Amino acid sequence: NFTAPVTTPSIPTPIQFLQTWLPGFVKVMTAARKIDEIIGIDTVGSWEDQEIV
Amino acid sequence: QGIVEPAGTAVEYGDHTNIPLTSWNANFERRTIVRGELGMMVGTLEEGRASAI
Numbered sequence: 847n848f849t850a851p852v853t854t855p856s857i858p859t860p861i862q863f864l865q866t867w868l869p870g871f872v873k874v875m876t877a878a879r880k881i882d883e884i885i886g887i888d889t890v891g892s893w894e895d896q897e898i899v
Numbered sequence: 900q901g902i903v904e905p906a907g908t909a910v911e912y913g914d915h916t917n918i919p920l921t922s923w924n925a926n927f928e929r930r931t932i933v934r935g936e937l938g939m940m941v942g943t944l945e946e947g948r949a950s951a952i
Contacts, residue, residue, distance in 0.1 A: 863951040 901927050 891898060907921030 859948045859951060864948070 901925055 903923050903925055905921065905923045908919065910917070910919045
């Protein structure tokens, strides 16, 4: 008496919308490098050289 | 709505030989008017969810 729908009843709005993505990205940090603060840095030779005397 | 139903006929022409006349008779008919209504209801939170898709 109430007629039959041609589509299955469902909630209209999918969850793929209604979502806010934060603009940033968090990056893994790992340990630190501190040899320069301990003993300094000095440029002596050049690339494609062999030895220092 | 109405109708007219005219009437009249010729008698052939001649001087001093009377003048025929015409007339009419009207009738009427009536009907009834039917009206229907339909509306809608929209909520503030419902409106925004639909705009996503």
